[PDB]
Structure formats: C-alpha cells, structure tokens
Amino acid sequence: MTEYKLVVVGADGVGKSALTIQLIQNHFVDEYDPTIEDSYRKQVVIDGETCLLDILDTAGSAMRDQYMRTGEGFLCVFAINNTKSFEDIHHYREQIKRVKDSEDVPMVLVGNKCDLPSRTVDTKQAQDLARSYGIPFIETSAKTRQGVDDAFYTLVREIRKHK
Template structure:
C-alpha cells in the first residue's frame, strides 16, 4: 500500500456515565484493535487507512490526568444531552486547555444520548461551547453508529492536513476498515446494543 504510517493519539474525556467507553467500542466495532490497561485508564489501539495513509491510533479512555493528556494530538470531549451536570464538567475542562500543548491540537465536542425523552442541553448550547473551544461539534445517539465513525474521522482527516487547509464544511468518512474478532463483537452486542433500536437522530456542526 502506498503512503507512510502516521501516529495519532486521542483522549476521550467526560464525566462518569456519559458513555465514553461505549463511544470507543462503537468506533472500533469495524476495526481490529488491542486493549491494554494502565494505572490511569485504558488504551485502545487500532490501525486505519485514510487516503492510502496508514494511521496507528491510540485511544485513551481518560481519567483527566493532565500529564497524559499533554501527549495527545486530539481530544474527544463527551457530555450527555440529558444531563446538564455532564455539560458543566466539559465546560470546566475548557479551563485546562491553556495548560496543554496548542500546536496541532484538535478538539471535537460530542453530545450523547440524543434518543432519550428529555434533554437538558440543547443543540445551540453545545454548538456555542464548541465554537468557544474552536472544536467540531457532533450530537449522536449510540443507536446510530455511523455518526460515531464521523467523530473520529473528523479528527483523523484534519490530523493529516495542515491547519491552513482545514474547512468548516467537510464531512470526513473512513475509507477502509476491518472487523473485530467474533467473540469481541458478540460481547459488545450483548452488553451495549442488545434490545436497542437503531435511530437516526444525530446532528453535526462545525466551528
């Protein structure tokens, strides 16, 4: 395959119960992965191909350790649209951003659980916070996994391109993927998806 291999390290940050681990598993559902535990959390590793470029991806299920976050190229900041407290958690995290490396840093804000009957954080409030952080913004239900793919594709495509070429209208898509082993696929299905219905209620906005 043509092209060189690049490395990409992304931290998934959010309050308890917002679905950080679910987000990671849903993204990795179509990609081979390995998982290892550290004293501070879990790191998932996979390889994807975008435009003939291999990218080795480390995804950290973060425990908000600033030293660990400083080593990341990107952040996925997750809150539940059904919980104002989880949105406030991400708002407070914004205050830590100046302490982290700025050059080449990518951020995407994700509002989850859009399929619930009530919402405490509307789309416009999430978009306003994303603009303040110069971040992409997605809302998604975990019952609509294609939007989860877009979250990471958005970051990966921008990682490949210099900032001056970024646009606010791109909708990145992964070009190639592989499959998880059947036993892991079965575990994810039983523990996360069993009994759910697939709905398409997600929206996406950009800075």
C-alpha cells in the same frame, strides 16, 4: 503509517467507553463498568490514508498531566440529557489548554446519547459553545453508532490541520 494519539474526556457516565468500544469493536456496551484507564489501537482508512489510532479512554493527578501532554487530540464528551456534564466541558478544555500551554489544541465537542428522548442540552447550546471554542460539534449515539466514526475521524482531520 501515521499514528494519532486521541484522548476521550468527560464526566463520569457520558458514554466515553461506549463511544470508544463502538469505534474499536462495533459493539454497544449496555453495562456501566467504570474506567480507571484503557487504551486501544485500530488501523483505519481516513481520506484514503491508512493510519493507526491509539485511543485513550479516561476516568470521568500526575497521570492526567502525562496523558494530556501525550494526547494529540481530545474528544470532549457530554451527554445531551445531562446539563451538568455539558457545564463540565469548559473544565476539561481548561485542564488540557493549561497542560499543553496552547489555545490551539485539536478538539471535538461530542454530544452523546442522541438516541435518548428527554434531551436537556439543545443543539444550538452545544453548537454555540463549539463555535466559541473554534472546534467542530458532533452529535453521537454510542447505542445506535450514529456519528461515532465521524467524531473520531473529524478529530484526526483537526490534528492533520494543526500540523
């Protein structure tokens, strides 16, 4: 079966771990336990194809160069109530594009914490940025699990399209 190496990137606190844990364990992590590095495996069925997801959950370096080279697809995560994390997105995309020496790298823009009321990043703002990059935009909530499977499965489909 096909294996997909996915990397979850973004500013410290956007919900990279909570999104990953919701995907893998169907569990919401309320606590804020900072990540050094953690990878997870999950067998899933996407478009009738049973495949293996190998997901790397990163810290919000030679180690960074290595996983960006290895990573087939990237979830660029920001929190919808955090303008600073949205402003950070281009820095992550720039690092990945530089390491992979490609303007065509499978990526998905993820607007997390969509369950929270005081939103500072509009859907239009996020959609316009994702459109300028030629990538999908998915609104997610690691709290309710809204859009979690969508973000990861969409990334897998972007990888399938690329190859």
